[PDB]
Amino acid sequence: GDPPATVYRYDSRPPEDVFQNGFTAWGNNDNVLEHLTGRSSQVGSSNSAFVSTSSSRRYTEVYLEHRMQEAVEAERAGRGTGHFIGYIYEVRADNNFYGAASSYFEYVDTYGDNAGRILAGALATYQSEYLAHRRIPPENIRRVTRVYHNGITGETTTTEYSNARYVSQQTRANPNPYTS
Ligand SMILES: Nc1ncnc2c1ncn2[C@@H]1O[C@H](COP(=O)(O)OP(=O)(O)OC[C@H]2O[C@H](O)[C@H](O)[C@@H]2O)[C@@H](O)[C@H]1O
Ligand SMILES: NC(=O)c1cccnc1
């Protein structure tokens, strides 16, 4: 019943960056609906105040696999090399991580939605999702799984290593919804 002590994040950026610097959110837009619909992320206004994570490692693997498959399709069509490297970061959650579901229900029951119209064509999703407000320090980042895909040979290689900067502290995600 406790909030998760560990969450996961798929990101394209390599540990030389992330292990040293942590994750910082795009900007100061802490509207939960705009984030969960994807409107404030990289593909939208790139100003979200949240860093998305999941209590489900499988969720982040599916996400990684989708991006890898896009590279595979690009090579098959002559519009890419097929090369892809994706990373799944294992992260210790603390009180600055908020459950997406509870944050979403509170938000939309108060200010409402506009389904399909917040981002265009997007519904708000949130199942195993946890939102870190503004930043995840490098000290929270435990390890990474590196998935390397050779675009021409098709071989996929997976390796794992820990972050020297990780600090073992006793924390878990916030039990409460995010409120602005
Ligand atoms: N601060 C940054 N600086 C440079 N690149 C960044 C930065 N943040 C992200 N990227 C790059 O931007 C890429 C995407 O990271 P993100 O914008 O956080 O979005 P998501 O993928 O977590 O999903 C966010 C929400 O959207 C959907 O609704 C989801 O379900 C979530 O609810 C990173 O891999 C990096 O290449
Ligand atoms: N970037 C991610 O791993 C992620 C986790 C949960 C929801 N959306 C994105």
Domain presence at residue 23: yes
C-alpha distances out from residue 93 to 25, 55, 123, 136, 154, Å? 16, 9, 26, 9, 35
Give the ligand whose atoms come closest to the C-alpha of residue 57: 2
Domain presence at residue 98: yes
Say if CB 119 and CB 44 are below 8 A apart: yes
CATH code where residue 151 lies: 3.90.210.10
Range of the domain at 110: 6-162
Q: Residues 55, 57, 62, 67: is their CA dihedral positive or negative?
A: positive
Domain presence at residue 168: no
Say if CB 55 and CB 140 are below 8 A apart: no
Say if CB 132 and CB 99 are below 8 A apart: no
Domain presence at residue 171: no
Q: Residue 83 phi/psi, 5° resolution?
A: -70, 140
Into how many domains does the chain fold? Answer: 1
Which contacts of 67-73 are long-range, i.e. CB under 8 A and separated by 24 or more positions? 67/10, 67/12, 68/147, 68/149, 68/156, 71/149, 71/151, 72/149, 72/151, 72/154
- Tell me how many degrees the CA angle 93-168-99 measures, rounded to the nearest 5: 5
Six token digits for residue 21: 């610097």
The resolution, in Å, is 1.7
Domain presence at residue 178: no
Nearest CA to ligand 2 atom 8: 52
Domain presence at residue 84: yes
Six token digits for residue 153: 């040979």
**Which residues, in sequence order, are CB contacts of 107 under 8 Å at separation 6+?**
31, 32, 33, 177
Distance (Å) from CA 54 to ligand 2 centroid: 6
Nearest CA to ligand 1 atom 4: 26
How far is Cα of residue 147 from the mean position of the Cα atoms in its chain?
A: 16
Distance (Å) from CA 30 to ligand 1 centroid: 14
| Identity of residue 126 | Y
Which residues form the catalytic set?
35, 129
| Identity of residue 164 | A
d(CA 153, CA 72): 11
Domain presence at residue 65: yes
